[PDB]
């Protein structure tokens, strides 16, 4: 809606940074609203949904199992590993690692899962093979969050990320059971959501994944709608702002409030 576009541009002014935005119809794929749809932004932790999509694709092909238990050591642990740091002696299942990566944004969990598929270049090959010739992962946690200006590593475009998310949640790309598992991981309760979940009223469905990086990088991908069902994809990215985390949260929340108000 035009008034949401006015708020996206106001967010640019307040952050002193570029904001990328797109709304897709979940059923038809049609673009309802866009701003900088084909400019590149750092994915940050929003890639973890694409990762678990690649993992579920291999489960569907008989090349992986949700129940397989993986053992790791102290030397695998990177910064922010609230689940993986507790399971040094007993390990974790693929199921538990995808839950920890998407729901608890566990960085070690994302690295262990990247190891299962053969690293960042194999996530890029997965995406290339289902028709996303733009989105690319090049590095591991934590250095995929560096967000150097004009560096195309670990980047997507809003339009590419939105089309890919739609194909994972509703195509024939994953099986019915794997689609449900991916959206289930994205829907699960988190301790705090100061982004789209703060603007979302009771009765609305939201399945999302948020992102933060260096140089004021911030983002979110979401399937959401009224009446307890998703009916739209929303992708929001920003990079370059010197504004506090609180100020970046508030601007994305206000884009959400406008999206909901003018649904
Ligand atoms: C992606 O790069 C980060 C996702 N999760 C973050 C966030 O969105 O801010 C949270 C805060 C988890 N976290 C704390 C420290 N590092 N990650 S979660 O609450 O969404």
Instruction: Give the position, in ligand 1's atom list, of the atom nearest the Cα of 79.
Output: 16
- Residue 257's domain spans which residues? 2-262
The rounded distance, in Å, linking the Cα atoms of 224 and 187 is 10
Which residues are within 8 A (CB) of 94 and not within 5 positions of it... i.e. 6 or more apart?
55, 59, 64, 65, 66, 67, 68, 70, 113, 116
Q: Can you read off the two tokens belonging to residue 132?
A: 């996303």
Query: Among candidates 10, 68, 60, which has minimal Cα distance to 168?
Result: 60
User: Does residue 48 have a cis peptide bond before it, meaning omega lies within 30 degrees of 0?
Assistant: no
Tell me which residues are annotated as active site. 45, 143
Number of domains in the chain: 1
Breaks (C-N over 2.5 A) in the chain follow: none
Distance of alpha carbon 138 from alpha carbon 188, whole angstroms: 28
Q: What is the DSSP string of 39-59?
A: S-EE-GGGHHHHHHHHHHHHH
What burial letters (b/e) apply to 237-262, b meaning 16+ CB within 10 Å?
A: bbbbbebeeeebbbbbbbbbbbbbee
| Inter-residue contact 88 to 76 (CB < 8 Å) | no
Residue 157 CA to ligand 1 center (angstroms) comes to: 21
209 known member of a binding site:
yes
Q: How was this structure determined?
A: X-ray
Atom of ligand 1 at shortest range from CA of 220: 8
Could you tell me which of 239, 251, 225, 203 has the C-alpha nearest to residue 27? 225
Residue 228 has a CB neighbour count (10 Å cut-off) of 9
- Nearest CA-CA partner of 222 in 137, 157, 162: 162
Atom number, ligand 1, closest to the C-alpha of residue 190: 19
CB 45 within 8 A of CB 147: no
Q: Which residues line ligand 1 (CB under 6 A)?
A: 44-45, 80, 105, 190, 192, 210-213
Decide: 223 and 204 in contact? Cβ < 8 Å. no
CA 126 to centroid of ligand 1, rounded, Å: 25
The atom number, within ligand 1, closest to the CA of 192 reads 19
Give one DSSP letter per residue of the chain, joined into a string: -HHHHHHHHHHHHHHTSEEEEEEEETTT--EEEEESTTS-EE-GGGHHHHHHHHHHHHHHTTS--TT-EE---GGG--S--TTGGG-TTT-EEHHHHHHHHHTS--HHHHHHHHHHHTSHHHHHHHHHHTT-SS-B--S-TTGGG---TT--TTEE-HHHHHHHHHHHHHSSSS-HHHHHHHHHHHHS--S---SGGGSPPTT-EEEEEEEE-STT-EEEEEEEESTTS--EEEEEEEE---S-HHHHHHHHHHHHHHHHHT-
From 44, 99, 104, 210, the mutation candidate for ligand 1 (largest count of ligand atoms within 8 A of CB) is 210
Strands 155-156 vs 18-25: parallel, antiparallel or unpaired? unpaired
Angle made by CA atoms 166, 156, 173, in degrees to the nearest 5: 30
Inter-residue contact 95 to 64 (CB < 8 Å): no
CA neighbours closer than 13 Å in the CB half-sphere of residue 82: 10
What tokens appear for 150 in the block?
């004009």
- How far, CA to CA in Å, does 25 sit from each of 31, 140, 262? 7, 32, 15
CATH number reported for the structural domain that contains residue 84 in this entry:
3.40.710.10
Residue nearest atom 9 in ligand 1 by C-alpha distance: 212
| CA triple 49-53-58, angle to 5 deg | 150
Would you say 132 and 164 are in contact if contact means Cβ atoms under 8 Å apart? Answer: yes
- Is the torsion defined by CA of 60, 63, 68, 72 positive or negative? negative
Strands laid side by side in the 232-239 sheet: 31-35, 18-25, 232-239, 218-225, 205-212
Q: For ligand 1, atom 13, which residue shows the shortest CA distance?
A: 105
Resolution for this experimental structure (Å): 2.5
Q: Which residue is associated with the tokens 């970046």?
A: 248
User: Mutation test of ligand 1: which of 106, 212, 238 has the most ligand atoms closer than 8 Å to its C-beta?
Assistant: 212
Centre of ligand 1 to C-alpha 211, Å, is: 6
């Amino acid at each position: 809606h035009p008034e949401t576009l006015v708020k996206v541009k106001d967010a640019e002014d307040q952050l002193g940074a570029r904001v990328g935005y797109i709304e897709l119809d979940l059923n038809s794929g049609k673009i309802l609203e866009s701003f900088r749809p084909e400019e590149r932004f750092p994915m940050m932790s929003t890639f973890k949904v694409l990762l678990c999509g690649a993992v579920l694709s291999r489960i569907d092909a008989g090349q992986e199992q949700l129940g397989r238990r993986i053992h790791y050591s102290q030397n695998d642990l990177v910064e922010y590993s609230p689940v993986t740091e507790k399971h040094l002696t007993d390990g974790m299942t693929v199921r538990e690692l995808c839950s920890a990566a998407i729901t608890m944004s566990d960085n070690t969990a994302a690295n262990l899962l990247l190891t299962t598929i053969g690293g960042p270049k194999e996530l890029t090959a997965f995406l290339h093979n289902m028709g996303d010739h733009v989105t690319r992962l090049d590095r591991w946690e934590p250095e995929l969050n560096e967000a150097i200006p004009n560096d195309e590593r670990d980047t997507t475009m809003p339009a590419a990320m939105a089309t890919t998310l739609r194909k994972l949640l509703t195509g024939e790309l994953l099986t019915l059971a794997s689609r449900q598992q991916l959206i289930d991981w994205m829907e699960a309760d988190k301790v705090a959501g100061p982004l789209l979940r703060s603007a979302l009223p009771a009765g609305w469905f939201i399945a999302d994944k948020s992102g933060a990086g260096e140089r004021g990088s911030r983002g979110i991908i979401a399937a959401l709608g009224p009446d307890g069902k998703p009916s739209r994809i929303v992708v929001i990215y920003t990079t370059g702002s010197q504004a506090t985390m609180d100020e970046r949260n508030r601007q994305i929340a206000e884009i959400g409030a406008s999206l909901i108000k003018h649904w």
